[PDB]
Amino acid sequence: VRLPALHIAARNDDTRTAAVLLQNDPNPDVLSKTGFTPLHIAAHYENLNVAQLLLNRGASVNFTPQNGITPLHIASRRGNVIMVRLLLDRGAQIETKTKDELTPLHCAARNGHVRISEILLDHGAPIQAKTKNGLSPIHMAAQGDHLDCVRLLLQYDAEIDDITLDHLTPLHVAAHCGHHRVAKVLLDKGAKPNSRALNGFTPLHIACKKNHVRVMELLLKTGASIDAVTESGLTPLHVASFMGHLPIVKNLLQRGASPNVSNVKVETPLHMAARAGHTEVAKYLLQNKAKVNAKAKDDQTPLHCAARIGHTNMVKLLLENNANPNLATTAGHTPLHIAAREGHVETVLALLEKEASQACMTKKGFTPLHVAAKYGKVRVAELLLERDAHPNAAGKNGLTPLHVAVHHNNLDIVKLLLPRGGSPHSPAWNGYTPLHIAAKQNQVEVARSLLQYGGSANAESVQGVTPLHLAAQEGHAEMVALLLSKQANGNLGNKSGLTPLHLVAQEGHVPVA
Amino acid sequence: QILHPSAGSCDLVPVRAVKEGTLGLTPAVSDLFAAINASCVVWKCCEDGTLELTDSNTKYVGNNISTKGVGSDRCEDITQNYKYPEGSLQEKEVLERVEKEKMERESPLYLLLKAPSSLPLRGDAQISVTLVNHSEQEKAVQLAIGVQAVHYNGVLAAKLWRKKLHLTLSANLEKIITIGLFFSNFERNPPENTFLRLTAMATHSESNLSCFAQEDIAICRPHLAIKMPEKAEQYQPLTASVSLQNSLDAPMEDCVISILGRGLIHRERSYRFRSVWPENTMCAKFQFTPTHVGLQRLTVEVDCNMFQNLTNYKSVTVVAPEL
Amino acid sequence: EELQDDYEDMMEENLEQEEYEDPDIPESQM
């Protein structure tokens, strides 16, 4: 687990120990466990004397380990100007690539070594060489905020609009990393300000995504399009409002960016600031032009988007300005419906304080109380029933909130609806009562609550079917015994005369019979 | 490490401590951090005496932190050693931590000012003021433009130019105003080694708030071009030609040129060249013998009645004679 | 102290093999 003695001598620049070792063992290219020769160590630490000794004793100046890191690569990465010179005079190859296709110029430019980069360029290094991801040395210089390296590479006729495999120009990289000085040099040297990435992202889009305000001002000063869209229709205000960067949003709106723009999903910048919860960005959007009641796909408002995530103070902000809670989607869902689905009690309370109508019904026929009863939201149902909610509201199908609480097996909603007015004697379109559903689904505890509040076990459907008929047909012996102790008639027949024993015979449950 | 004297005693502050806002490591981290992270608040001084807050453009501090490059006469930017990129997550973290430590211890109008980075000496340049009305009604806006000479340390030198415009902005309309910044309009010549503070101030009706922007403009002097071979032999005569183009509005009089440089010229040699009329060129040749082997540098200084201490340099590698 | 760099693990850490690689090209899909 210790290094070979020649590596240790190379690290310490000990030429006497190295000379003794090479007199004993004449191999200067002894390999460590990682496969690095002592020349690699000498190039890393810029130990000139031991490097000259090793090269005079026959060390491979162009040694290539499995990862392809030559000593010239290490000297260029570390900034060892004198070692780079010495290796170049002894025959170091200038175009050799690593496993990720990095040249020594890539290593020099990534770490911003201007002198080394100029030395390699003067020896014929390829300035347009690419890595596995298509990064030229100017990309690596722009990524590291190496202003003078970018300047030197541009002076050596590097392509200012070279793209990576992701179609990223050096301006794109400068905008992504927030290096406004590199971006300034590139744009003053003629870089295109509206270059498109793979997803149609301009450098302005990336600057507005990462809250890089100085890059944004520098781009807009040099003729970047403020209304440029991506493939999805994203404006820089859509990106800034979604990410919540208030300085970017304020600067874009001050300069005259349109705030009522839409994308494929017909979403607006206020929609993305409601769906993300940035109340201050949305507040500034509404001070300027913004349609608070604007509609997207599926007829969704920013109130719909704010109610889904449950961010309460945005709901209060949107509602206080001009938002109308009674607006509904294509499926008929008002923001009260969405808030009741996710159990957002504070959002429901804020919506209800601003005249949200619980009488609004979806296409299926569901009030917000229905949705709470379907999804088991007992805090929302408690708050709705507290303030003007009809427990026996029904649509065309006749389903009440008690129907959908029993159907989805929400005991807490059932135990909350019954004392407040949820009637057990409410028939559906087919005449089914809430006790009909419990008896079929073997909800014994729900049935006990339904029976305790006056549920009738002999209530009949449109075809004469009682809950005892459904319990016996489904083979629920405990349900049948419960109903039979609450005045259920076991001899009662349906329209065709079928008794519960007939329905037991059809399916074959011995314990029920 | 950064040497930071305190009016006294001196402190050694690591650059990383300033970058990370490690206030408490050394006593001077707070001052160095405030040197490159403070915010600028602009107040308008009304003639009534009341001090009104102004809606001003962001004045960034700690810009282009520069030092001489290694192995070259190029300029290296080391701002990333002192600061995270503006608006980044790391800068946000550092700023919030510094704010937390200090707290524990203790509009319808938009103005955009476009200015060139330099104004030629006794020369001409154009500036642009963009005003954007966001109100639904038209605005009677008083736009005030000022030019002031400021020293390197921010001390006000002299008031050079003021300009008052009266514009009407249509509702939801952007207006671009181009103003020519001419040296001959200045009430007095700027003092030497000073910079130009260009300010714009837009006030409308009785909104009690004024848009404000400012830009620092450097004064650009004629380029001193030095022509000299890249390599020179030791103990052999070497000729360096120096050229200057008179791009001013007056002749260059009382003209003195000096040449120096350690390893090429013993002390300095000053010469007189003829007066240069406008749009003409000086072209002076100097012969000297380099006597020290190595990478040397020739420094040329030109003096006249229009400008003084105009200095340019050129590097020459002096090589040993062939054996 | 002063002898940790003589070992293969420490020298591998010192040589920083990750800086001779293309790390990634992040996009941060929104």
Side-chain angles (χ1 to χ4, degrees), chain C residues 7-17 19-23:
Chain C
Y7 297 63
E8 308 249 25
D9 297 341
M10 202 37 142
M11 189 65 104
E12 220 201 16
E13 283 211 314
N14 285 326
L15 289 168
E16 297 179 282
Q17 267 156 255
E19 334 275 2
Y20 304 88
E21 290 174 312
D22 230 5

mmCIF file with all atom_site columns, all heavy atoms in Angstrom, chain C residues 7-24, unseen atoms left out:
data_model
loop_
_atom_site.group_PDB
_atom_site.id
_atom_site.type_symbol
_atom_site.label_atom_id
_atom_site.label_alt_id
_atom_site.label_comp_id
_atom_site.label_asym_id
_atom_site.label_entity_id
_atom_site.label_seq_id
_atom_site.pdbx_PDB_ins_code
_atom_site.Cartn_x
_atom_site.Cartn_y
_atom_site.Cartn_z
_atom_site.occupancy
_atom_site.B_iso_or_equiv
_atom_site.pdbx_formal_charge
_atom_site.auth_seq_id
_atom_site.auth_comp_id
_atom_site.auth_asym_id
_atom_site.auth_atom_id
_atom_site.pdbx_PDB_model_num
ATOM 1   N N   . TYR C 1 7  ? 1.782   7.092  0.228   1.00 0.00 ? 7  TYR C N   1
ATOM 2   C CA  . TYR C 1 7  ? 0.901   5.943  0.102   1.00 0.00 ? 7  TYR C CA  1
ATOM 3   C C   . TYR C 1 7  ? 0.016   6.088  -1.128  1.00 0.00 ? 7  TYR C C   1
ATOM 4   O O   . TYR C 1 7  ? -0.292  7.198  -1.566  1.00 0.00 ? 7  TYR C O   1
ATOM 5   C CB  . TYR C 1 7  ? 0.055   5.757  1.366   1.00 0.00 ? 7  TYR C CB  1
ATOM 6   C CG  . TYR C 1 7  ? 0.890   5.471  2.598   1.00 0.00 ? 7  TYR C CG  1
ATOM 7   C CD1 . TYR C 1 7  ? 1.796   6.407  3.088   1.00 0.00 ? 7  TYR C CD1 1
ATOM 8   C CD2 . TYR C 1 7  ? 0.799   4.254  3.251   1.00 0.00 ? 7  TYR C CD2 1
ATOM 9   C CE1 . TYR C 1 7  ? 2.572   6.148  4.184   1.00 0.00 ? 7  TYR C CE1 1
ATOM 10  C CE2 . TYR C 1 7  ? 1.572   3.986  4.362   1.00 0.00 ? 7  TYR C CE2 1
ATOM 11  C CZ  . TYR C 1 7  ? 2.457   4.938  4.824   1.00 0.00 ? 7  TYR C CZ  1
ATOM 12  O OH  . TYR C 1 7  ? 3.232   4.677  5.930   1.00 0.00 ? 7  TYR C OH  1
ATOM 13  N N   . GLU C 1 8  ? -0.380  4.942  -1.686  1.00 0.00 ? 8  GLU C N   1
ATOM 14  C CA  . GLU C 1 8  ? -1.033  4.924  -2.991  1.00 0.00 ? 8  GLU C CA  1
ATOM 15  C C   . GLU C 1 8  ? -2.399  5.599  -2.959  1.00 0.00 ? 8  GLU C C   1
ATOM 16  O O   . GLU C 1 8  ? -2.778  6.283  -3.915  1.00 0.00 ? 8  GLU C O   1
ATOM 17  C CB  . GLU C 1 8  ? -1.153  3.488  -3.496  1.00 0.00 ? 8  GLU C CB  1
ATOM 18  C CG  . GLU C 1 8  ? 0.157   2.729  -3.468  1.00 0.00 ? 8  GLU C CG  1
ATOM 19  C CD  . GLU C 1 8  ? 0.695   2.448  -4.853  1.00 0.00 ? 8  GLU C CD  1
ATOM 20  O OE1 . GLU C 1 8  ? 0.361   3.205  -5.785  1.00 0.00 ? 8  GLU C OE1 1
ATOM 21  O OE2 . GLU C 1 8  ? 1.466   1.478  -5.008  1.00 0.00 ? 8  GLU C OE2 1
ATOM 22  N N   . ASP C 1 9  ? -3.161  5.408  -1.880  1.00 0.00 ? 9  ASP C N   1
ATOM 23  C CA  . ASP C 1 9  ? -4.470  6.046  -1.788  1.00 0.00 ? 9  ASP C CA  1
ATOM 24  C C   . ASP C 1 9  ? -4.345  7.564  -1.731  1.00 0.00 ? 9  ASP C C   1
ATOM 25  O O   . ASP C 1 9  ? -5.064  8.283  -2.438  1.00 0.00 ? 9  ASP C O   1
ATOM 26  C CB  . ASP C 1 9  ? -5.226  5.523  -0.568  1.00 0.00 ? 9  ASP C CB  1
ATOM 27  C CG  . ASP C 1 9  ? -5.517  4.039  -0.654  1.00 0.00 ? 9  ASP C CG  1
ATOM 28  O OD1 . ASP C 1 9  ? -5.470  3.486  -1.772  1.00 0.00 ? 9  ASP C OD1 1
ATOM 29  O OD2 . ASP C 1 9  ? -5.795  3.426  0.398   1.00 0.00 ? 9  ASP C OD2 1
ATOM 30  N N   . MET C 1 10 ? -3.424  8.068  -0.908  1.00 0.00 ? 10 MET C N   1
ATOM 31  C CA  . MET C 1 10 ? -3.243  9.511  -0.800  1.00 0.00 ? 10 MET C CA  1
ATOM 32  C C   . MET C 1 10 ? -2.711  10.101 -2.097  1.00 0.00 ? 10 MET C C   1
ATOM 33  O O   . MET C 1 10 ? -3.103  11.203 -2.486  1.00 0.00 ? 10 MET C O   1
ATOM 34  C CB  . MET C 1 10 ? -2.312  9.845  0.361   1.00 0.00 ? 10 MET C CB  1
ATOM 35  C CG  . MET C 1 10 ? -2.476  11.260 0.885   1.00 0.00 ? 10 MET C CG  1
ATOM 36  S SD  . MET C 1 10 ? -4.192  11.811 0.860   1.00 0.00 ? 10 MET C SD  1
ATOM 37  C CE  . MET C 1 10 ? -4.269  12.747 2.385   1.00 0.00 ? 10 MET C CE  1
ATOM 38  N N   . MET C 1 11 ? -1.817  9.385  -2.782  1.00 0.00 ? 11 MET C N   1
ATOM 39  C CA  . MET C 1 11 ? -1.290  9.897  -4.041  1.00 0.00 ? 11 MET C CA  1
ATOM 40  C C   . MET C 1 11 ? -2.358  9.878  -5.130  1.00 0.00 ? 11 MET C C   1
ATOM 41  O O   . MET C 1 11 ? -2.404  10.769 -5.983  1.00 0.00 ? 11 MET C O   1
ATOM 42  C CB  . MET C 1 11 ? -0.060  9.097  -4.464  1.00 0.00 ? 11 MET C CB  1
ATOM 43  C CG  . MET C 1 11 ? 0.672   9.702  -5.649  1.00 0.00 ? 11 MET C CG  1
ATOM 44  S SD  . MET C 1 11 ? 1.369   11.312 -5.230  1.00 0.00 ? 11 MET C SD  1
ATOM 45  C CE  . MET C 1 11 ? 3.103   10.912 -5.043  1.00 0.00 ? 11 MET C CE  1
ATOM 46  N N   . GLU C 1 12 ? -3.230  8.868  -5.113  1.00 0.00 ? 12 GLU C N   1
ATOM 47  C CA  . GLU C 1 12 ? -4.357  8.842  -6.039  1.00 0.00 ? 12 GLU C CA  1
ATOM 48  C C   . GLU C 1 12 ? -5.296  10.015 -5.789  1.00 0.00 ? 12 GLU C C   1
ATOM 49  O O   . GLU C 1 12 ? -5.805  10.633 -6.730  1.00 0.00 ? 12 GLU C O   1
ATOM 50  C CB  . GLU C 1 12 ? -5.111  7.517  -5.917  1.00 0.00 ? 12 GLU C CB  1
ATOM 51  C CG  . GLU C 1 12 ? -5.577  6.950  -7.243  1.00 0.00 ? 12 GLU C CG  1
ATOM 52  C CD  . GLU C 1 12 ? -6.708  5.956  -7.088  1.00 0.00 ? 12 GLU C CD  1
ATOM 53  O OE1 . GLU C 1 12 ? -7.330  5.924  -6.004  1.00 0.00 ? 12 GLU C OE1 1
ATOM 54  O OE2 . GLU C 1 12 ? -6.979  5.206  -8.050  1.00 0.00 ? 12 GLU C OE2 1
ATOM 55  N N   . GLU C 1 13 ? -5.545  10.329 -4.515  1.00 0.00 ? 13 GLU C N   1
ATOM 56  C CA  . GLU C 1 13 ? -6.354  11.501 -4.191  1.00 0.00 ? 13 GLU C CA  1
ATOM 57  C C   . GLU C 1 13 ? -5.665  12.789 -4.628  1.00 0.00 ? 13 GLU C C   1
ATOM 58  O O   . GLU C 1 13 ? -6.321  13.720 -5.111  1.00 0.00 ? 13 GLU C O   1
ATOM 59  C CB  . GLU C 1 13 ? -6.652  11.537 -2.692  1.00 0.00 ? 13 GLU C CB  1
ATOM 60  C CG  . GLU C 1 13 ? -7.735  10.568 -2.252  1.00 0.00 ? 13 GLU C CG  1
ATOM 61  C CD  . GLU C 1 13 ? -8.522  11.075 -1.059  1.00 0.00 ? 13 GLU C CD  1
ATOM 62  O OE1 . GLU C 1 13 ? -7.895  11.560 -0.094  1.00 0.00 ? 13 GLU C OE1 1
ATOM 63  O OE2 . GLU C 1 13 ? -9.768  10.989 -1.088  1.00 0.00 ? 13 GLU C OE2 1
ATOM 64  N N   . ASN C 1 14 ? -4.343  12.865 -4.458  1.00 0.00 ? 14 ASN C N   1
ATOM 65  C CA  . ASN C 1 14 ? -3.600  14.066 -4.824  1.00 0.00 ? 14 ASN C CA  1
ATOM 66  C C   . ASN C 1 14 ? -3.601  14.293 -6.331  1.00 0.00 ? 14 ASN C C   1
ATOM 67  O O   . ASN C 1 14 ? -3.729  15.432 -6.791  1.00 0.00 ? 14 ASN C O   1
ATOM 68  C CB  . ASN C 1 14 ? -2.166  13.976 -4.303  1.00 0.00 ? 14 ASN C CB  1
ATOM 69  C CG  . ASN C 1 14 ? -2.073  14.202 -2.808  1.00 0.00 ? 14 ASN C CG  1
ATOM 70  O OD1 . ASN C 1 14 ? -2.835  14.978 -2.238  1.00 0.00 ? 14 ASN C OD1 1
ATOM 71  N ND2 . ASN C 1 14 ? -1.125  13.529 -2.167  1.00 0.00 ? 14 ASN C ND2 1
ATOM 72  N N   . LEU C 1 15 ? -3.453  13.223 -7.115  1.00 0.00 ? 15 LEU C N   1
ATOM 73  C CA  . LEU C 1 15 ? -3.363  13.367 -8.563  1.00 0.00 ? 15 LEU C CA  1
ATOM 74  C C   . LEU C 1 15 ? -4.673  13.825 -9.191  1.00 0.00 ? 15 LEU C C   1
ATOM 75  O O   . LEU C 1 15 ? -4.648  14.366 -10.302 1.00 0.00 ? 15 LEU C O   1
ATOM 76  C CB  . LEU C 1 15 ? -2.906  12.053 -9.194  1.00 0.00 ? 15 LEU C CB  1
ATOM 77  C CG  . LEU C 1 15 ? -1.447  11.676 -8.932  1.00 0.00 ? 15 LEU C CG  1
ATOM 78  C CD1 . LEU C 1 15 ? -1.178  10.240 -9.346  1.00 0.00 ? 15 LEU C CD1 1
ATOM 79  C CD2 . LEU C 1 15 ? -0.500  12.625 -9.646  1.00 0.00 ? 15 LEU C CD2 1
ATOM 80  N N   . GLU C 1 16 ? -5.803  13.618 -8.512  1.00 0.00 ? 16 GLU C N   1
ATOM 81  C CA  . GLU C 1 16 ? -7.104  14.162 -8.907  1.00 0.00 ? 16 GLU C CA  1
ATOM 82  C C   . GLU C 1 16 ? -7.492  13.710 -10.320 1.00 0.00 ? 16 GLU C C   1
ATOM 83  O O   . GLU C 1 16 ? -7.575  14.498 -11.263 1.00 0.00 ? 16 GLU C O   1
ATOM 84  C CB  . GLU C 1 16 ? -7.109  15.690 -8.797  1.00 0.00 ? 16 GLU C CB  1
ATOM 85  C CG  . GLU C 1 16 ? -6.898  16.229 -7.402  1.00 0.00 ? 16 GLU C CG  1
ATOM 86  C CD  . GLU C 1 16 ? -6.896  17.742 -7.365  1.00 0.00 ? 16 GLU C CD  1
ATOM 87  O OE1 . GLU C 1 16 ? -5.867  18.347 -7.733  1.00 0.00 ? 16 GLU C OE1 1
ATOM 88  O OE2 . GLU C 1 16 ? -7.926  18.329 -6.975  1.00 0.00 ? 16 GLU C OE2 1
ATOM 89  N N   . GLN C 1 17 ? -7.719  12.400 -10.438 1.00 0.00 ? 17 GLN C N   1
ATOM 90  C CA  . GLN C 1 17 ? -8.070  11.812 -11.727 1.00 0.00 ? 17 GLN C CA  1
ATOM 91  C C   . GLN C 1 17 ? -9.398  12.325 -12.269 1.00 0.00 ? 17 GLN C C   1
ATOM 92  O O   . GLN C 1 17 ? -9.648  12.201 -13.473 1.00 0.00 ? 17 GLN C O   1
ATOM 93  C CB  . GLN C 1 17 ? -8.118  10.290 -11.609 1.00 0.00 ? 17 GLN C CB  1
ATOM 94  C CG  . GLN C 1 17 ? -6.816  9.605  -11.967 1.00 0.00 ? 17 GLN C CG  1
ATOM 95  C CD  . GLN C 1 17 ? -6.686  8.249  -11.314 1.00 0.00 ? 17 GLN C CD  1
ATOM 96  O OE1 . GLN C 1 17 ? -5.936  8.083  -10.353 1.00 0.00 ? 17 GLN C OE1 1
ATOM 97  N NE2 . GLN C 1 17 ? -7.417  7.268  -11.829 1.00 0.00 ? 17 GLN C NE2 1
ATOM 98  N N   . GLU C 1 18 ? -10.254 12.893 -11.417 1.00 0.00 ? 18 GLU C N   1
ATOM 99  C CA  . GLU C 1 18 ? -11.550 13.382 -11.873 1.00 0.00 ? 18 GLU C CA  1
ATOM 100 C C   . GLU C 1 18 ? -11.446 14.683 -12.659 1.00 0.00 ? 18 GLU C C   1
ATOM 101 O O   . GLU C 1 18 ? -12.377 15.018 -13.397 1.00 0.00 ? 18 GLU C O   1
ATOM 102 C CB  . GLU C 1 18 ? -12.488 13.571 -10.680 1.00 0.00 ? 18 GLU C CB  1
ATOM 103 N N   . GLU C 1 19 ? -10.344 15.419 -12.526 1.00 0.00 ? 19 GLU C N   1
ATOM 104 C CA  . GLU C 1 19 ? -10.167 16.663 -13.265 1.00 0.00 ? 19 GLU C CA  1
ATOM 105 C C   . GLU C 1 19 ? -9.641  16.448 -14.676 1.00 0.00 ? 19 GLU C C   1
ATOM 106 O O   . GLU C 1 19 ? -9.470  17.428 -15.408 1.00 0.00 ? 19 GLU C O   1
ATOM 107 C CB  . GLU C 1 19 ? -9.232  17.606 -12.506 1.00 0.00 ? 19 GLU C CB  1
ATOM 108 C CG  . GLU C 1 19 ? -9.202  17.380 -11.013 1.00 0.00 ? 19 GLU C CG  1
ATOM 109 C CD  . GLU C 1 19 ? -10.307 18.114 -10.282 1.00 0.00 ? 19 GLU C CD  1
ATOM 110 O OE1 . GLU C 1 19 ? -11.123 18.780 -10.951 1.00 0.00 ? 19 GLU C OE1 1
ATOM 111 O OE2 . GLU C 1 19 ? -10.362 18.025 -9.036  1.00 0.00 ? 19 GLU C OE2 1
ATOM 112 N N   . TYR C 1 20 ? -9.374  15.204 -15.071 1.00 0.00 ? 20 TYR C N   1
ATOM 113 C CA  . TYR C 1 20 ? -9.020  14.876 -16.444 1.00 0.00 ? 20 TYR C CA  1
ATOM 114 C C   . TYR C 1 20 ? -10.177 14.210 -17.174 1.00 0.00 ? 20 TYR C C   1
ATOM 115 O O   . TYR C 1 20 ? -9.965  13.502 -18.163 1.00 0.00 ? 20 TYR C O   1
ATOM 116 C CB  . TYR C 1 20 ? -7.775  13.988 -16.480 1.00 0.00 ? 20 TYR C CB  1
ATOM 117 C CG  . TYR C 1 20 ? -6.585  14.591 -15.767 1.00 0.00 ? 20 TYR C CG  1
ATOM 118 C CD1 . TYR C 1 20 ? -6.388  14.381 -14.409 1.00 0.00 ? 20 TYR C CD1 1
ATOM 119 C CD2 . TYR C 1 20 ? -5.669  15.383 -16.447 1.00 0.00 ? 20 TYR C CD2 1
ATOM 120 C CE1 . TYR C 1 20 ? -5.313  14.932 -13.753 1.00 0.00 ? 20 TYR C CE1 1
ATOM 121 C CE2 . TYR C 1 20 ? -4.587  15.939 -15.796 1.00 0.00 ? 20 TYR C CE2 1
ATOM 122 C CZ  . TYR C 1 20 ? -4.416  15.710 -14.449 1.00 0.00 ? 20 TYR C CZ  1
ATOM 123 O OH  . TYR C 1 20 ? -3.345  16.260 -13.786 1.00 0.00 ? 20 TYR C OH  1
ATOM 124 N N   . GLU C 1 21 ? -11.401 14.427 -16.699 1.00 0.00 ? 21 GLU C N   1
ATOM 125 C CA  . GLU C 1 21 ? -12.595 13.826 -17.268 1.00 0.00 ? 21 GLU C CA  1
ATOM 126 C C   . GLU C 1 21 ? -13.607 14.910 -17.592 1.00 0.00 ? 21 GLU C C   1
ATOM 127 O O   . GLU C 1 21 ? -13.627 15.970 -16.962 1.00 0.00 ? 21 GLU C O   1
ATOM 128 C CB  . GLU C 1 21 ? -13.230 12.818 -16.304 1.00 0.00 ? 21 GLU C CB  1
ATOM 129 C CG  . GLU C 1 21 ? -12.426 11.554 -16.106 1.00 0.00 ? 21 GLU C CG  1
ATOM 130 C CD  . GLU C 1 21 ? -13.011 10.660 -15.032 1.00 0.00 ? 21 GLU C CD  1
ATOM 131 O OE1 . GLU C 1 21 ? -13.320 11.170 -13.936 1.00 0.00 ? 21 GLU C OE1 1
ATOM 132 O OE2 . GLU C 1 21 ? -13.161 9.448  -15.288 1.00 0.00 ? 21 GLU C OE2 1
ATOM 133 N N   . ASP C 1 22 ? -14.445 14.637 -18.586 1.00 0.00 ? 22 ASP C N   1
ATOM 134 C CA  . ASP C 1 22 ? -15.605 15.477 -18.843 1.00 0.00 ? 22 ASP C CA  1
ATOM 135 C C   . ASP C 1 22 ? -16.677 15.122 -17.821 1.00 0.00 ? 22 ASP C C   1
ATOM 136 O O   . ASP C 1 22 ? -17.274 14.042 -17.904 1.00 0.00 ? 22 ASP C O   1
ATOM 137 C CB  . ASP C 1 22 ? -16.120 15.281 -20.270 1.00 0.00 ? 22 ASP C CB  1
ATOM 138 C CG  . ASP C 1 22 ? -16.327 16.592 -20.997 1.00 0.00 ? 22 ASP C CG  1
ATOM 139 O OD1 . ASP C 1 22 ? -15.987 17.648 -20.427 1.00 0.00 ? 22 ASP C OD1 1
ATOM 140 O OD2 . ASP C 1 22 ? -16.832 16.565 -22.138 1.00 0.00 ? 22 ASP C OD2 1
ATOM 141 N N   . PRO C 1 23 ? -16.935 15.991 -16.834 1.00 0.00 ? 23 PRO C N   1
ATOM 142 C CA  . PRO C 1 23 ? -17.833 15.616 -15.732 1.00 0.00 ? 23 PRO C CA  1
ATOM 143 C C   . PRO C 1 23 ? -19.258 15.363 -16.192 1.00 0.00 ? 23 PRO C C   1
ATOM 144 O O   . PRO C 1 23 ? -19.794 14.267 -15.995 1.00 0.00 ? 23 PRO C O   1
ATOM 145 C CB  . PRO C 1 23 ? -17.757 16.824 -14.786 1.00 0.00 ? 23 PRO C CB  1
ATOM 146 C CG  . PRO C 1 23 ? -16.593 17.648 -15.269 1.00 0.00 ? 23 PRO C CG  1
ATOM 147 C CD  . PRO C 1 23 ? -16.496 17.391 -16.731 1.00 0.00 ? 23 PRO C CD  1
ATOM 148 N N   . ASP C 1 24 ? -19.861 16.362 -16.832 1.00 0.00 ? 24 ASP C N   1
ATOM 149 C CA  . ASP C 1 24 ? -21.230 16.275 -17.324 1.00 0.00 ? 24 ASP C CA  1
ATOM 150 C C   . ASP C 1 24 ? -21.515 17.515 -18.156 1.00 0.00 ? 24 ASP C C   1
ATOM 151 O O   . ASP C 1 24 ? -20.706 18.445 -18.225 1.00 0.00 ? 24 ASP C O   1
ATOM 152 C CB  . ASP C 1 24 ? -22.245 16.153 -16.183 1.00 0.00 ? 24 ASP C CB  1
#
